[PDB]
Ligand SMILES: O=C(O)CNC(=O)C(=O)O
């Protein structure tokens with residue numbers, strides 16, 4: 602069995618190997634990359650996402666989100682307070698202000714220490730989940746707006762045509778902006794490109810051990826667990842690496858830098874934080890190997906998770922017994 606310790610793997614495809622996206626994901630899996638839940642892909646030196654980032658300041662962040670924490674430094678939840686609209690140029694100036702900017706630090710490990718010590722005492726503002734793309738239309742390789750759609754994959758594998766669309770999302774971050782522990786909708790893959798700015802640190806639990814994270818989460822967030830049998834779908838709970846280690850939960854960590862891709866694999870729980878002002882683009886995708894994960898994915902039906910239009914068909918076709926309850930939670 603390849604990668605039996607479930608380490609995060611880093612790949613350096615050549616320009617020739619960068620042509621065929623599906624083939625390269627399958628290659629990474631042949632080497633055991635999925636066992637980690639997360640892989641890094643460094644693009645060939647010949648490749649670029651677009652020519653420059655000099656003309657992005659007028660993008661609008663319609664609903665910036667202030668991420669307010671509750672709990673203790675290593676075990677906390679966050680809620681999202683809506684703020685007034687602002688442009689990316691305005692948000693960049695805010696991220697660089699004395700109130701929000703990255704503190705002085707020695708290296709990524711010192712900044713990680715400072716994150717976990719101090720995150721709860723601040724409320725950073727995240728420009729998340731903005732439909733759109735920063736890839737040039739002429740970029741033909743690993744262009745996250747030109748991937749094969751999940752609806753087409755389900756049709757190819759299973760024979761059933763379904764409604765829905767699959768487009769990318771932009772994320773504008775600042776110091777301490779946080780992504781809570783989660784797997785993707787329907788335990789899909791995700792791919793994330795860091796277009797510009799400061800790094801993003803990731804934590805991930807191997808898919809084979811995801812239920813160990815779920816059991817810890819139920820212990821640590823006992824009111825939330827009574828409320829919903831899949832409350833990590835709410836995307837609000839944080840648990841630090843120190844707490845994971847104290848509780849014996851297998852995990853790994855890695856820092857993504859500008860110009861690098863990350864892929865999350867089906868049922869790979871992940872969480873993390875941004876180092877300073879940055880912009881990322883991400884999208885969900887599927888392969889043949891996903892179908893069995895989609896059929897077994899948990900679902901939130903309490904009403905909290907609320908998701909896109911396109912998840913309806915995935916539940917309806919892959920999980921017909923669960924459909925009626927899940928749809929009630931959507932309505
Ligand atoms: O970058 C973020 O805030 C969160 N991203 C992801 O969870 C992802 O790409 O799967």
Ligand SMILES: [Mg+2]
Nearest residue numbers: 657658659660
């Ligand atoms: Mg602009």
Ligand code: NI
Nearest residue numbers: 784785791865
């Ligand atoms: Ni994700």
Ligand SMILES: [Zn+2]
Nearest residue numbers: 829901903905
């Ligand atoms: Zn729920």
